[PDB]
Design a protein around this nucleic acid. Structure first.
Lengths: 84, 131, 113
RNA sequence: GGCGGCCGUAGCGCGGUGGUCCCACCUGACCCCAUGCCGAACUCAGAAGUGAAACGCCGUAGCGCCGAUGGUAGUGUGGGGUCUCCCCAUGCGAGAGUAGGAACUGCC
RNA sequence: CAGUGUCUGGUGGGUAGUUUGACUGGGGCGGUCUCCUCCUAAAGAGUAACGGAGGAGCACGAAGGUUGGCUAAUCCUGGCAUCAGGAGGUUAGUGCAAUGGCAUAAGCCAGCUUGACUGCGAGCGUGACGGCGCGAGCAGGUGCGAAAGCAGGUCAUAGUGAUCCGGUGGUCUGAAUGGAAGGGCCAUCGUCAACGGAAAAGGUACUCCGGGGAUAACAGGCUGAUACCGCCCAAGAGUUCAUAUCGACGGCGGUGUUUGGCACCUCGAUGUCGGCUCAUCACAUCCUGGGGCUGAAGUAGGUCCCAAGGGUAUGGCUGUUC
RNA sequence: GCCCCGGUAAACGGCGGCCGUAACUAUAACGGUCCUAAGGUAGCGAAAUUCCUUGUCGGGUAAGUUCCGACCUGCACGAAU
RNA sequence: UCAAACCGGGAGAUAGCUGGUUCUCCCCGAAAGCUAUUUAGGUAGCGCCUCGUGAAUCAUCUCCGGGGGUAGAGCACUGUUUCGGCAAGGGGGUCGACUUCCAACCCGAUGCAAACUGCGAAUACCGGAGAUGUUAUCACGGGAGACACACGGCGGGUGUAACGUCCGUCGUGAAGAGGGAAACAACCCAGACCGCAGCUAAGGUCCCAAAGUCAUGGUUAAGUGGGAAACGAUGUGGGAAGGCCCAGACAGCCAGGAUGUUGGCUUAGAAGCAGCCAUCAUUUAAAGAAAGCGUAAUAGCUCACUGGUCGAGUCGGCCUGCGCGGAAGAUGUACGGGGCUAAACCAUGCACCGAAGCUGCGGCAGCGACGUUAUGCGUUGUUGGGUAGGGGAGCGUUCUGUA
RNA sequence: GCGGAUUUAGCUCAGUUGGGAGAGCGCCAGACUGAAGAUCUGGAGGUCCUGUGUUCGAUCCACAGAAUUCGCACCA
RNA sequence: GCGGAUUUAGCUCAGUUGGGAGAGCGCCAGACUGAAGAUCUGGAGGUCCUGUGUUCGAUCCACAGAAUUCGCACCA
RNA sequence: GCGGAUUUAGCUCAGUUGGGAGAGCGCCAGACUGAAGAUCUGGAGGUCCUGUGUUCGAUCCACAGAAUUCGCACCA
């Protein structure tokens, strides 16, 4: 029923995440990168996470959220190639 | 030996206990030991009881380090049995420059004779410090 | 990310900011009704008109009714079209339906917004 | 109080002082309109009474958070000895301690 | 009358052919062999052991969606049920293991409502490989919403399985045509959880054989907690007297004769136990020799030191080593 | 034929817990009380069938884990098994 | 010959089980891991090796733009953990108050965490510019081997520990020869065609053994020449710090250790000296109501304390180098041996010996590059080690053709 | 899968003129007996499988569904 | 050491819809009998092994520990 | 030697909130009975193995020693 044995986190296997979409090349508005699911907001390049900063770039495409609270889950403001 | 602490089985009791001395005035004297070493509560008692049984002239004798690290043993076959709590009870961690016993006393040292008796009970060459 | 204080009061709208346009705030006081065409990045007011200013034209009755709410909408919008704005979204933070805010919006469209 | 600019060191606690211009509290619910049980919500109307919640100013830095002047442990990377272990070269440098900041700026 | 020929049901190792799994600090017993989630895994990724802690093989039309109102645990005060006030980011709650997320909320209460739609693509799973899953579009069209928009079931990661055959929804298909009964395309459901799926028990000192000791049961090797012995400090005992003698607690060591552990070595075979016979070596000396102490009057002893040169040697019962 | 019923053991078997009594103490012995029907009546033991065990007492011997006799709760004695 | 004949044939029965099989030379030159498997003494698919064909021009430290939170450290959740004070509850003792003990809360001082963390590396890593490398990078196809590794170092997890199991990175053992280390798979230096000359690396320079029995300075005596530990050490050397020193003290020798008091209590007695408590003062340079011997208790004898006389540095303490005690065993005892006091050790220094290493002459080759019809020349790069394995050339033998 | 039988008060069962729901046992009470027992009497106790349909009205007809039992069929 | 069973009021035991702690015997008292006995009635008698974790609440679930018993293992 | 249990008034035993030393039997006395018996009541009876340590205080904690018992261990 409950949970016992004063223990912390619960484990299993190896993570199933990747680094798809380095971004500096074309990219249709879709989930750039993969780690955890369910998240929206970013509609372009919005790599911004606590640290030395983050980035992405060039690619004119309406929308394009991130994975979730990970590699810059925050939603910055627009960005395209330079001249789409 | 990774520092073990809580979330474990209940073992034995402290062979130690009597903090001794009056806790009305805090001082900064001491008896430092040059070198890191693990001392079990069973040893701390012998050394502590040695000086206390000598400093009958007064008091103000206090200890700062307490035994908090658990150490188990597995007296049996092998495959089965991680480690139970036997003679090897709580053990304290002493740093190369840590003060174990400090008695609140000004140059009237009648405890140097006491600390000497204890210095011969704990494994590690200790030195008497005035500061 | 966490929900900002403004998001907790849901008075703001992030979905209208993803487009990059302007808003049409409708403030209402038990005495007067205000309307503005503010643009993102702070409180940038391009054009605005108060029901009290409607008196400058020739308003006689009270300024806290529905017919007055529609009069202000036509004024704020008329000045907006004179500014250079065409489209705008309705932003009525906290209010009911068919109220004075709807009369303000219906008035804005009547002008050309 | 109105009207702008810059536009996250403005989290969270605490002190003094002023305005009957402005503004909420407040007061009253005839009616539009509205509450599963309650005009409290919701919506309308008037201004008897304050500034007590706001606001304008201004005084403490507690605690959070963001920068700066001083320094040892800690730690890469490559050769030395030594029973273990320790040392040298080279790129940096814990926490404790001394100070900084409690808005800024134009107009009526 | 039955016999005999044929067939059907029941009984039927009496007889015949086989199966009776794998993992597994040998094998067997016990425990496992699918799947999810922390540590271990040593800050990308991946990573083992009967490795430590714990679970899934379902349940649910609502524990779904939207909107309005509201905000919790817990503690304090006035009356533990309830009501009023205060403190209170939140430790509550959110179906399920755990982490992560969330409060003018993704939580609570109430009302309403019900997208779990059809069709077809692009992308994601180092390094190719299916089913399945998920993120993100388009075309048309269901539900809710003012609308953007939100659904491809339940916040995310466990709740699952082929071929053959059968049962269920349009069409195609056998000299020549009609009727009936079949075969096939697409899809759903039914079982293999030793879960990438064979229908099948036992005996073997009556045994036989292939081979082997990357996986155990001896000797060696390392360790040494256990065992043996010593040392330091010395409480206390000994009428008084720590130390003639005995000597705890605690601390520090040596040996490796015991036991335990590991399993690094052997594993291409060096006849067992005990005894007997015969040869050499060692010492932790039981004496003889020379000494110290004594709770040493003497005598006789007790304990200790140097020392092994010699002497240290035997018998009765029992195969028996106590 | 089976289910069902019944005869047959010259097929596999079973025979506990508690209380009172009594004893210098513990046990065995007898009755009952309870559980599941009974709880071993007629006969037989440390036995080549008893581990613990050179079991206990004793004879015998200077001394016998041997033997004999007795007690006996007989780890898992018993009537043509 | 039997818990069951022989012969031949089917048979060249089958096996996921063991083992294995005959010429030369040239070029290049692995994996012992992942997924599935009645699968783990087996295979298949990949990683990895090799060969062939095709295509066509690019790969890489440092800086910049990024992802990480492990080490360390710390405390804000969380689970632990020292002391004092206050308030509430329970229990016990004497009085409805107080005292003692236990648990929870708050405040000021005291301590921690492999599944905590406000912080936070180094470092590993994605992408892009500035070297190196070139038909590479890459595509397709053929043939693979291979899935019992091991060791050193660093970081580990388990274990008392192991020539322990089990991981990770890397270098090696395996194809590292050569040299040093006494001998020695993985320790140090270093990596090979042949022949020749030269110079060095490691190491070594008293002799065996090629090269100094070299230079300056210092230490040790033990032959220490180093298992050898925890532990111990005025054996001896070096360095630093405090205090005391020519008002001759500290030790000898002379003479001197009292008075109230046999302090009290206690005790058969205790009278400085069994024990229990105190330890004052009166008379001086100086004598403790007494540090030991002694008595049954006294007595007696010394010491402390001070003068006379005797006559110079002493005393307390910290640290370091080397040696010593602790170290007890098996047919004759040693650093490789002789042997050595330096041919030891420490701080410096000079000159040499010493490899197939480096340099240089000649010679063979191979591969690849450039130019080329050329595998003919010219020039250029590596230079040219190899088990399994892939590719390529050749000598010899038998018999049958033409010349 | 298929067909047959069965599906009434706790238990075991009767009940087709379609129009009363009933019996035995059991349970409770009474009577009786000193009393308990037995017998006798009395009372309580029924979604008469479920739904729908058929009639004026159905336990008692029709249809559909469920359960029990049985035969048969299936079973690498 | 391994595995299984057991661990409720003095004794012996029942007790899983997790939400009542209960029975027999025994003990005390009553009723009865002259009385004692037996029978009948009534009462008292429970850290339901211990701790912790569960749920609104657990003897009745999970985990850890302890005790009893049995099989096995060990035994120069 | 190793490990476990036990070591309370004469006997058999209870007794962990560490702060009362207690029960049954036995012994003596009383009550009762003619009396003795039984039963009821009352009293006496404890270095709670020994030493030391731990606390304010220990039977009730720690350590050491002794005794009893059981399992195990070594037999020319």
């Amino acid at each position: 029923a409950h949970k016992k044995a004063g223990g912390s986190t619960r484990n299993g296997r190896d993570s199933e995440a990747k680094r798809l979409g380095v971004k500096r090349f074309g990219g249709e508005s879709v989930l750039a990168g993969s780690i955890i699911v369910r998240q929206r907001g970013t509609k372009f390049h919005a790599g911004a996470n606590v640290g030395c900063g983050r980035d992405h770039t060039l690619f004119a495409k309406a929308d394009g959220k991130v994975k979730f609270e990970v590699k810059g889950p925050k939603n910055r403001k627009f960005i395209s190639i330079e001249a789409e | 030996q990774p520092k073990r602490t809580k979330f474990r089985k209940m073992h034995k009791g402290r062979n130690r206990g009597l903090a001794q001395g009056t806790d009305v005035s805090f001082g900064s004297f001491g008896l430092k030991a040059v070198g890191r070493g693990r001392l079990t509560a069973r040893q701390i008692e012998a050394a502590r009881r040695a000086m206390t049984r000598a400093v009958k002239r007064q008091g103000k004798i206090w200890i700062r380090v307490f035994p908090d690290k658990p150490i188990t043993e597995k007296p049996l076959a092998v495959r089965m049995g991680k480690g139970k709590g036997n003679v090897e009870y709580w053990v304290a961690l002493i740093q190369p420059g840590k003060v174990l016993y400090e008695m609140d006393g000004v140059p009237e040292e009648l405890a140097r004779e006491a600390f000497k008796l204890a210095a011969a009970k704990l494994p590690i060459k200790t030195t008497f410090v005035t500061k | 990310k966490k929900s900002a204080r403004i998001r907790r009061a849901t008075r703001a709208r992030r979905k209208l900011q993803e487009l990059g346009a302007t808003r049409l705030v409708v403030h209402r006081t038990p005495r007067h009704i205000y309307a503005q065409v503010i643009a993102p990045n702070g409180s940038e007011v391009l054009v605005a008109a108060s029901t009290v200013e409607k008196a400058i034209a020739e308003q006689l009755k009270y300024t806290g009714n529905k017919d007055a709410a529609a009069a202000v909408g036509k004024a704020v919008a008329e000045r907006a079209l004179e500014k250079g704005i065409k489209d705008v979204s309705f932003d009525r933070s906290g209010f009911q339906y068919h109220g004075r805010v709807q009369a303000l919006a219906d008035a804005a469209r009547e002008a050309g917004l």
